[PDB]
Design a protein around this ligand. Structure first.
Ligand code: CHL
Ligand code: CHL
Ligand code: CHL
Ligand code: CHL
Ligand code: CHL
Ligand code: CLA
Ligand code: CLA
Ligand code: CLA
Ligand code: CLA
Ligand SMILES: CC1=C[C@H](O)CC(C)(C)[C@H]1CCC1=C/C(=C/C(C)=C/C=C/C=C(C)/C=C/C=C(C)/C=C/[C@@]23O[C@]2(C)C[C@@H](O)CC3(C)C)OC1=O
Lengths: 202, 202, 202
């Protein structure tokens, strides 16, 4: 109403319009998904602006056969990620590091492993604060308003990611390329004109 | 049982067999969807019988570039929709008229804007009657029986529309063309023989 | 916990993790589906090992035009299913027999038709026993443990069948051929390498 006039509501703010809100755990899920989606969309966006490589084919740059092609990708970097001819980055090193670091972080967050700190943060609280609000924005501002803004950005980013998935399938081009083609000539470059062309299959 | 012996039941008539009936609003949704589906299937059907143009490609006839191709399509019409060479119908005129008329009707029905009449019709009642039963069939006949017949036609039309969607995807032909091909040789023209051919992709 | 430490639980054993357990009928459904899935996966598996013909195209061997190609397929058989040149098996005979036998069995199981026996077996009980446990394993062992093992095999076989569906769509080869290609070179033959190749469409 006042803070959420848009379609639907927030958990603790009313009744869901279509899919019933029956489990509180879903609330946590919705936030976690949302945070990842934000990092996803931004990432895809930024990377395509920096390298021209669409997000859905970037994985081919790093395989056990070769992962050196990513070494010089990052814009403005004072040096490549590894020297030329050193055979680095190595795919297995990247994979082992990701497994260890992200697995440990997720285990600490979800209660699989006991926390390394002794601050009493609660497992299952998607807004824990403390060390995870190091600049103290949640105590200097309005916590409930900030949570609503965060939830809205979560939902928007997830819907944008769904759009990215199906735009990739339907156009076989990057999302930034889709955006450029639309803004150049919106009447003649959109989903309906693409469908008239058969989406590349019909 | 007596009035609904077929699989399932109707809202207020028992328990849903598979997907639970939990919200009364879904009941309204089911009727509204259903009415559109009827107009949809009939439309596709009739248009393909009159013009030979399948429903899933008829949109390409009317674009901002050109919409005059629809002028002479309606069978038996004493004149085209607009004179030849006049540049009409115009896509923008069609779009604006649809937005105004259908938007106003939907707003009146859904309570977004107040009703233009003062008859006290209830917003949210999918069977309001009154001016929407001008011939008075609901009071001359059995209202509950007529509502059951309407609900059955709603469900049947919606399932037929789902069939139209997937038949279009699988055969790339109009639904009436599918019907003719099946009745001409049903053993050798059906979904299984189409699947053996790969649905045009395998 | 003790008997079901894996993710999730069993009906009567706790709360469903994601999709709520609200109807007891679904429990029966899950078992019946599961049993068919086992027979499915096994069947596909065994048939591909015996004939080399993938499960998703085996139907083309038997149509009203011709069903003699199946006569000599079964490995080690002392004779073909019918004499050569006899025009058998006939598709219509196979179809009629399947309809009569499987339809009668399903009607007896589901209470559509009254049971031919007078043993008092309960319709709706997916673990009836009696004549359906002729070797008496359910009373010689632990019934609850055996039911848990059966439920686990049900769920595993259903997930494997879902894998078979999408592997057929993505690779256009038999599931056993997929297994051989993966085990021969798992780093270079998997879903990611197939995706880099476009799944045959991109
Ligand atoms: C968040 C994780 C993550 C995601 C989403 C992707 C996604 C992708 N990678 Mg990448 N990767 C990820 C992590 C990583 N990748 C790689 C390394 C590679 C390589 C080397 C390659 C890829 C490739 C691909 C693409 C093709 C995959 C495919 O078959 O898509 C088909 C699948 C879909 C279209 C959607 C399927 C989703 C669905 C099955 C599950 C969704 C279910 C819901 C979660 C829940 C549903 C509800 C429940 C109740 C039923 C795809 C864009 C390939 C590529 O780029 O090819 C061009 C490729 O070659 N990746 C690494 C190692 C550093 C990762 C490590 O984190
Ligand atoms: C001389 C050094 C140097 C320079 C001039 C640039 C310049 C650029 N980089 Mg590159 N980079 C540099 C070194 C490096 N970059 C990266 C990694 C990246 C990434 C991941 C990205 C860029 C991007 C960009 C562009 C941002 C344009 C824009 O609109 O910014 C807008 C202005 C701002 C964002 C404000 C300026 C940022 C400033 C506050 C410093 C930020 C610090 C870091 C985030 C690290 C510290 C984090 C925490 C601890 C504080 C720009 C061309 C972006 C791009 O490609 O855009 C399309 C991008 O996404 N760079 C690495 C690591 C390999 C570098 C190391 O050598
Ligand atoms: C009810 C409205 C309506 C519908 C269903 C369609 C449908 C269609 N139009 Mg048409 N139009 C409609 C109104 C209008 N059209 C046009 C003008 C045009 C043009 C100019 C063109 C089309 C075209 C098309 C087709 C290709 C679109 C596409 O990308 O399909 C792909 C999408 C799908 C196959 C399915 C998508 C459904 C899914 C994404 C959402 C479903 C969600 C559920 C409703 C809810 C789910 C549950 C929740 C809880 C999650 C398609 C048959 C194009 C065409 O004919 O190409 C040959 C074309 O060029 N239309 C006008 C202007 C007069 C309309 C006016 O209202
Ligand atoms: C000389 C005039 C004239 C004639 C002879 C025809 C003849 C035909 N039109 Mg065509 N039309 C004519 C003028 C017009 N038509 C249309 C719009 C349509 C449409 C939208 C359709 C046809 C269809 C048909 C065919 C119906 C075949 C059938 O089985 O009907 C079955 C017999 C009946 C339905 C009963 C006879 C109808 C009768 C009750 C009059 C109907 C009145 C209107 C619905 C208006 C009612 C308004 C309300 C407020 C009372 C037939 C070839 C249909 C078609 O293509 O079929 C494949 C079709 O869907 N016509 C327009 C507007 C552009 C016309 C204006 O000039
Ligand atoms: C001389 C007779 C004869 C021989 C030597 C074989 C040999 C073979 N058959 Mg073939 N069959 C024979 C006659 C027949 N077969 C079949 C129908 C099948 C089928 C449906 C299948 C085979 C399969 C197999 C192979 C099993 C390999 C394995 O690892 O087994 C592992 C070892 C065992 C399973 C143990 C040995 C079985 C033993 C307990 C006897 C089973 C009796 C019967 C099931 C009938 C009795 C049922 C109830 C009452 C107990 C093997 C090459 C399988 C295949 O293709 O594998 C890839 C397969 O799925 N055969 C029919 C009916 C048309 C036959 C009749 O003439
Ligand atoms: C996985 C992500 C996710 C999750 C877990 C939730 C969870 C929740 N949402 Mg949220 N929501 C999401 C995404 C998600 N949402 C997105 C993307 C949007 C923007 C469109 C919204 C918009 C939204 C609104 C407006 C409202 C909620 C509400 C709710 C709550 C009740 C509904 C529920 O339990 O849904 C759980 C069920 C699901 C998440 C299943 C979603 C439906 C399926 C069919 C997915 C269909 C799309 C799928 C991605 C297709 C993939 C195809 C493939 C080929 C790629 C609950 C806390 C309501 C609320 O707060 O009530 C108090 C509410 O009013 N959500
Ligand atoms: C935040 C979400 C978001 C945004 C900003 C965009 C933006 C864009 N999309 Mg994308 N898209 C989205 C979600 C989004 N999409 C989703 C969820 C899907 C999956 C259905 C798609 C599928 C898709 C395809 C297949 C294509 C685009 C295309 C485009 C571009 C051209 C505009 C167009 O045709 O839009 C069309 C928008 C959609 C198909 C999404 C509609 C989602 C729901 C809300 C349907 C409602 C439609 C109805 C008329 C409005 C209801 C009233 C109210 C809710 C507003 C543009 C850059 C086209 C492109 O690349 O052109 C170059 C193109 O071909 N999008
Ligand atoms: C969107 C249309 C729609 C809606 C809103 C409803 C709503 C309802 N139906 Mg109805 N129904 C529909 C279509 C619809 N039905 C169709 C097409 C049929 C014919 C097959 C039926 C047959 C039917 C029966 C037999 C019964 C009901 C019942 C019910 C009620 C309880 C179930 C429920 O809440 O479902 C709401 C949930 C949904 C509408 C989601 C549907 C499932 C999803 C996964 C969609 C799957 C198909 C999808 C279109 C695929 C798209 C693919 C894409 C690529 C194009 C409720 C009032 C029961 C009742 O009256 O109980 C008292 C009952 O017994 N319905
Ligand atoms: C049709 C098969 C089926 C059925 C009827 C059930 C039914 C049940 N399961 Mg079981 N389950 C299944 C398959 C099935 N399961 C599979 C394959 C697995 C292994 C992954 C499991 C794993 C599992 C666990 C771990 C648990 C359950 C639980 C439950 C219970 C609560 C959930 C519920 O009601 O779901 C009914 C709703 C559905 C079956 C819909 C499923 C979701 C849809 C969207 C389908 C998505 C995939 C689909 C096939 C895509 C097709 C694409 C097409 C192009 C081919 C209920 C008795 C819970 C329980 O026992 O709680 C006490 C529980 O903890 N199940
Ligand atoms: C719920 C509900 C309630 C109401 O009552 C009604 C209604 C509103 C209808 C409904 C709404 C129903 C509904 C639910 C829903 C869910 C969606 C879309 C969820 C999407 C999650 C997306 C995530 C986590 C994305 C993560 C991306 C990463 C990690 C990317 C990472 C890389 O991309 C990077 C950065 C670079 C690449 O190169 C490499 C990779 C790929 C790794 O969508 C919906 O519509």
């Amino acid at each position: 109403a006042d803070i959420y006039p848009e379609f639907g509501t927030y958990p603790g703010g009313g009744e869901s319009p279509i899919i019933p809100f029956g489990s509180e755990k879903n609330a946590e899920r919705e936030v976690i998904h949302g945070r990842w989606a934000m990092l996803g969309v931004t990432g895809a966006w930024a990377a395509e602006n920096g390298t021209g490589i669409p997000w859905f084919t970037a994985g081919t740059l790093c395989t056990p056969d070769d992962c050196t092609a990513v070494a010089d990708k990052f814009p403005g970097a004072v040096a490549p990620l590894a020297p030329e001819g050193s055979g680095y980055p190595s795919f297995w090193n990247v994979l082992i590091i990701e497994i260890v670091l992200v697995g440990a972080a997720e285990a600490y967050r979800t209660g699989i492993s006991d926390s390394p700190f002794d601050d009493g943060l609660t497992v299952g609280d998607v807004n824990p604060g403390g060390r995870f609000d190091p600049l103290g924005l949640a105590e200097s501002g309005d916590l409930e308003e900030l949570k609503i803004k965060e939830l809205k950005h979560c939902r928007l980013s997830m819907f944008a990611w769904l759009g990215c998935i199906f735009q990739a399938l339907a156009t076989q081009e990057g999302p930034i390329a889709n955006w450029q083609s639309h803004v150049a000539d919106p009447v003649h470059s959109n989903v309906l004109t693409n469908a008239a062309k058969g989406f590349g299959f019909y």
